[PDB]
Design a protein around this ligand. Structure first.
Ligand SMILES: O=c1ccn([C@H]2C[C@H](O)[C@@H](COP(=O)(O)NP(=O)(O)OP(=O)(O)O)O2)c(=O)[nH]1
Ligand SMILES: [Mg+2]
Ligand SMILES: [Mg+2]
Ligand code: NA
Ligand code: NA
Length: 326
DNA sequence: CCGACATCGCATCAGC
DNA sequence: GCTGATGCGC
DNA sequence: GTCGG
């Protein structure tokens, strides 16, 4: 919030290039800049001062100068006036409506909340659930509620089988006082990178949480990734808690540290760290860190015993979860 | 310059 | 049905 | 849009 005007402006630009332009790389660029400016511990006085930060190049620096002089950015004033953009940006806020569907619905003449509720038959299952909880999914989750939600998940998980390990990652593991959703990383000794000795390891846990009415809706579901909806139980006479997004990732137990690294994030932190891994000649995913022969093709999984081992391989100081909120 | 830009699971559709 | 391209998740 | 060779 110290350069909060500049980082917002850049976040708006990022969303424009993503939802309207469909320029994924311009989107990531704006977001990197906004991230490296958010952590910058001084109040930016000029575009040139900002340009010294990596990821802030010439075009962004002039946009900062313009914002500092006037309080605004004309390119954004224009983008806001355009009706196709405004519609597209709005539709992309429904979970499951991306840039393509959004542009597609606009061509169909579907461009308001009202248009979507009246053409529910024109949405896929995810989009239908994303529309139903539209308001709820715009709210943040207070850490106190994350804590309540954590008890239930962990204790319900323990009820299905004491050998599961469930770990709330995401922004919650980085200490955030609020979160957009709850991310849960799941391990069980039966599912390793070697073998799967038990099927439906994820289904059972989803099933338990549906049973106790914690999980209310399913966005998508496969053998290792669940994306759905949950809700904390309310007390008597008390207004209900908003419905919350929940993601659940089942990961081979021997690959826990790579998995907990990835799912802890932030997304921009993983991108910076994975790009540094590439520059150091490594490739990191949620399963393994592997070397790169000049071939291009990744070699074999390196041995990992902690999050820090991954950091060491690319020659970075270890950074605590709270210090990864980029 | 100009090629790269992080990485992948699940849903959906088209081609066969 | 199987395969492969594409969208979408943020 | 930025960055590295
Ligand atoms: O494009 C992405 C998105 C997420 N991720 C990762 C990191 C991340 O923090 C984790 C969970 O994703 P979320 O969408 O839940 N973002 P996060 O939990 O960090 O913040 P919040 O959910 O409160 O907006 O998975 C990526 O690696 N790439
Ligand atoms: Mg999250
Ligand atoms: Mg999530
Ligand atoms: Na720079
Ligand atoms: Na969306």
């Amino acid at each position: 919030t110290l350069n909060g005007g500049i980082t917002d402006m850049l976040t708006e630009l990022a969303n424009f290039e993503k939802n309207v332009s469909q320029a994924i790389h311009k989107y990531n660029a704006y977001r990197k800049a906004a991230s490296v400016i958010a952590k910058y511990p001084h109040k930016i006085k000029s575009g040139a001062e900002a340009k010294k930060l990596p990821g802030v190049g010439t075009k962004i620096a002039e946009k900062i100068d313009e914002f500092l002089a006037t309080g605004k950015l004309r390119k954004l004033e224009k983008i806001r006036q355009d009706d196709t953009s405004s519609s597209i940006n709005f539709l992309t806020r429904v979970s499951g409506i991306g840039p393509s569907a959004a542009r597609k619905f606009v061509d169909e003449g579907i461009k308001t909340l009202e248009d979507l509720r009246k053409n529910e038959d024109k949405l896929n299952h995810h989009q239908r659930i994303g529309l139903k909880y539209f308001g709820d999914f715009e709210k943040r989750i207070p850490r106190e509620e994350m804590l309540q939600m954590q008890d239930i998940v962990l204790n319900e998980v323990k009820k299905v089988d004491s050998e599961y390990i469930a770990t709330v990652c995401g922004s919650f593991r980085r200490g955030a006082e609020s979160s957009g959703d709850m991310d849960v990383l799941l391990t069980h000794p039966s599912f390793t990178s070697e073998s799967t000795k038990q099927p439906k390891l994820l289904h059972q846990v989803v099933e338990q949480l549906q049973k106790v009415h914690f999980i209310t809706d399913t966005l998508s579901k496969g053998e290792t990734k669940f994306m759905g909806v949950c809700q904390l139980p309310s007390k008597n006479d008390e207004k209900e808690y908003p419905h919350r997004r929940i993601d659940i990732r089942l990961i081979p137990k021997d690959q826990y540290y790579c998995g907990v690294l990835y799912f802890t994030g932030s997304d921009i932190f993983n991108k910076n760290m994975r790009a540094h891994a590439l520059e150091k000649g490594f490739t990191i995913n949620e399963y393994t860190i592997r070397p790169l022969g000049v071939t291009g093709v990744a070699g074999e999984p390196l041995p990992v015993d902690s999050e820090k081992d991954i950091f060491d391989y690319i020659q970075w100081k270890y950074r605590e979860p709270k210090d990864r909120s980029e």
